[PDB]
Design a protein around this ligand. Structure first.
Ligand SMILES: *[C@@H]1O[C@H](CO)[C@@H](O)[C@H](O)[C@H]1NC(C)=O
Length: 395
């Protein structure tokens, strides 16, 4: 059962008459649903994402400066000017330098000086923000029936089904193989509010970093870095990463404040990560409430005869699942298919069956069955699968 793979697992149980079940599925969680006369089902919210979300601003973390130009005039010669002062994509500073005979001016005094640099951004040194549209966000829910077959996490359960939901398409009917149809009504509106969320992306090809972060819109909009719209050619406020030195005669130095990535990363510690897979921008945390309709589900193998009580052996002896249940797997050497005669008694009371089965109507099919998950009361018990027995101390 898929839910046995994780630590975060909930059990939902429907009694007599319970045909519908309302669950709050959370990313990283898993729910096992059990109900009288119904095959058990594992359900979980698998992903929350939007393909190609809209991009808000792009910020530059490392300025690439080039073509530094300086123009200086002697004290009586008027303002110094450069064509660059009027071009976008350049950062300039006008100042005054001390001039005199030493640097070829007729008078000793203040002379106009102006320096400009072309400012661009280093390749792969942008920080881009993305915003979600509640109407385009997709919630993916997976359902897997309890078939008495154990499948590891790196393996694929042939009976697992997937359902996708958007605000405009909240209901799906899934056919669970021979178990019947299950209906899922999940409301995206009951999900995570995304108004103040921005998915921040740096360079997703960097190997030792998460591919994205989920940050607050107000924090993102206040970053003190050069910015522009995707598609725009030049950067606004490029001066944020450039400093000019005090001028001396006909020269003025231009300083680059360096790569701000390290600075940003310190700010991002403790911020939740997100994930990008191609064009899909995923949230790594979130939840949604769904209504599961069980009325069309039917159990499998109810009319088989009981398996020969003499032909069972333990493939995997009873073991603690970590969810206060016991898991085990048996092998049957008799004729299939048949119902597995499972029960358990408390040490000293051989007459009362104390086993509460999670796995519905355990059966050995022609090519499956054998895995059983059950709950037992605290203390010493003995598990029986026909004549096959096993001691079990619960707790
Ligand atoms: C799953 O992982 C195990 C252990 O690493 C390996 O032996 C097995 O072949 C894997 N199976 C698949 C389908 O990846």
């Amino acid at each position: 059962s898929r839910c046995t793979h994780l630590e975060n697992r909930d059990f939902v149980t429907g009694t007599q008459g319970t045909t519908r079940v309302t669950l709050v599925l959370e990313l990283g969680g898993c729910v096992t649903i059990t109900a009288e006369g119904k095959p058990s089902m594992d359900v979980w919210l698998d992903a929350i994402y939007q393909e190609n979300p809209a991009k808000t601003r792009e910020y530059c973390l490392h300025a690439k400066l080039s073509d530094t130009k300086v123009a200086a005039r002697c004290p009586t010669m008027g303002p110094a000017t450069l064509a660059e002062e009027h071009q976008g994509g350049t950062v300039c500073k006008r100042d005054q330098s001390d001039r005199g005979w030493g640097n070829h001016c007729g008078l000793f005094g203040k002379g106009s000086i102006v320096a400009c640099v072309k400012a661009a951004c280093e390749a792969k040194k942008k920080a881009t923000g993305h915003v979600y549209d509640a109407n385009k966000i997709v919630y993916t829910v997976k359902v897997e029936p309890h078939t008495g077959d154990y499948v590891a996490a790196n393996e694929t359960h042939s009976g697992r089904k997937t359902a996708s939901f958007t605000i405009s398409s909240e209901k799906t009917i899934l056919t669970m193989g021979e178990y019947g149809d299950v209906s899922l009504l999940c409301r995206v509106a009951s999900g995570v509010d995304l108004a103040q969320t921005v998915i921040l992306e740096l360079d997703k090809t960097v190997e030792h970093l998460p591919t994205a972060w989920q940050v607050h819109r107000d924090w993102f909009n206040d970053l003190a870095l050069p910015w522009k719209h995707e598609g725009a050619q030049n950067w606004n406020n490029a001066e944020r990463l450039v400093e000019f030195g005090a001028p001396h005669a006909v020269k003025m130095d231009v300083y680059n404040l360096g790569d701000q990535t390290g600075v940003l990363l310190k700010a991002l510690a403790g911020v939740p990560v997100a994930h990008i897979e191609g064009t899909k921008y995923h949230l790594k945390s979130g939840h949604v409430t769904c209504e599961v309709g069980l009325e069309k589900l039917k159990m499998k193998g109810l009319t088989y005869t009981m398996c020969d009580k003499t032909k069972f052996t333990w493939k995997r002896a009873p073991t603690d699942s970590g969810h206060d249940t016991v898991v085990m797997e048996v092998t049957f050497s008799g004729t299939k298919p048949c119902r597995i005669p499972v029960r358990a008694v408390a040490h000293g009371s051989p007459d009362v069956n104390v086993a509460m089965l999670i796995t519905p109507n355990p059966t050995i099919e022609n090519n499956g069955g054998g895995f059983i998950e059950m709950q037992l009361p605290p203390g010493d018990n003995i598990i029986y699968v026909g004549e096959l027995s096993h001691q079990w101390f619960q707790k």
